[PDB]
Design a protein around this ligand. Sequence first.
Ligand SMILES: C[C@H](Oc1cc(-c2cnn(C3CCNCC3)c2)cnc1N)c1c(Cl)ccc(F)c1Cl
Ligand SMILES: C[C@H](Oc1cc(-c2cnn(C3CCNCC3)c2)cnc1N)c1c(Cl)ccc(F)c1Cl
Ligand SMILES: [Cl-]
Ligand SMILES: [Cl-]
Lengths: 154, 154
Amino acid sequence: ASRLYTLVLVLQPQRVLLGMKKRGFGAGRWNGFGGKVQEGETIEDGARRELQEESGLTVDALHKVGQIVFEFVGEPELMDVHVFCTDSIQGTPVESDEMRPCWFQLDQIPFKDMWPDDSYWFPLLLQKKKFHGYFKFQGQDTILDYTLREVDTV
Amino acid sequence: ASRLYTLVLVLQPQRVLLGMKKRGFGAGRWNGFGGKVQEGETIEDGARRELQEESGLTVDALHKVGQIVFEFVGEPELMDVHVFCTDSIQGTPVESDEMRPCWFQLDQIPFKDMWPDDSYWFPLLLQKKKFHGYFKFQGQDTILDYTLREVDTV
Ligand SMILES: C[C@H](Oc1cc(-c2cnn(C3CCNCC3)c2)cnc1N)c1c(Cl)ccc(F)c1Cl
Ligand SMILES: C[C@H](Oc1cc(-c2cnn(C3CCNCC3)c2)cnc1N)c1c(Cl)ccc(F)c1Cl
Ligand SMILES: [Cl-]
Ligand SMILES: [Cl-]
């Protein structure tokens, strides 16, 4: 009962790219780039595709950095989120009707306007750690319970 | 907002001692031996004392093997349980009005008539692993959420 999603962080030595969702769901928050994985498509290919669609950037190799499972109380489907990082990109970030990308210096990451789980796992990503997490949500703003640990193998 | 408790498992190569609580709280289940720690008493001394009180056995050195925190929904105080093991004891187990001790072969540990958290951490103890756990209970029979991991240092 899990649906695959990807999440991509463009993390460079002094800054990280995030996107402000402008409409529909998740509007108002900063987040990484990603989406659903297609039938017959690899998870990594889906991650590369969604990075382009949402940010305008072209990535070659993506690196696996985490897996997070989200449970939403009252919803049957779990989200199985495969998290990736890259430092090398081509192109410059594109603002669209859906998404407004911006670079953040690492000390200015806007945690108060990001999903609450990011406060837990993003700091691991910044120190080049890999992780497995599980977050149980009630609505969009409340973590009821979670687990998180560093791993050697994603 | 945590209260200290001890829990002692007499674990020998082929068998483990458990006690059937005969009355009051916990009646009807098999469990290890322990209780509250006194003012001015070390946690280990409290563990040794309670092993004698509840089982009739004298232990010298106890070995630290785990820490488990219990939360009961609707109750303010958490239980901070310090878990110990020993293989060497003196005396023979004593049945009292409060407790009926019995030896169990390791393949016959009565998990269905033990507290539900034991199904998670007891197998770690059997393989000489050390652990930190947290269990959130609703009533006596339902684990709502938990975390458990092996540790090098209790
Ligand atoms: C990028 C975003 O990240 C998060 C979303 C959420 C989240 C919270 N609520 N939702 C709802 C749950 C009800 N179904 C629609 C998404 C999604 C929590 N933490 C995140 N890091 C996201 C979204 Cl919108 C949708 C699927 C995802 F896998 C992710 Cl990572
Ligand atoms: C030996 C027993 O072990 C467990 C008790 C419980 C438990 C479940 N409910 N309770 C109630 C909670 C309400 N306050 C009285 C104890 C205790 C769960 N798992 C255990 N392994 C126990 C008891 Cl009765 C009391 C305090 C403890 F620290 C332990 Cl380990
Ligand atoms: Cl995100
Ligand atoms: Cl027990």
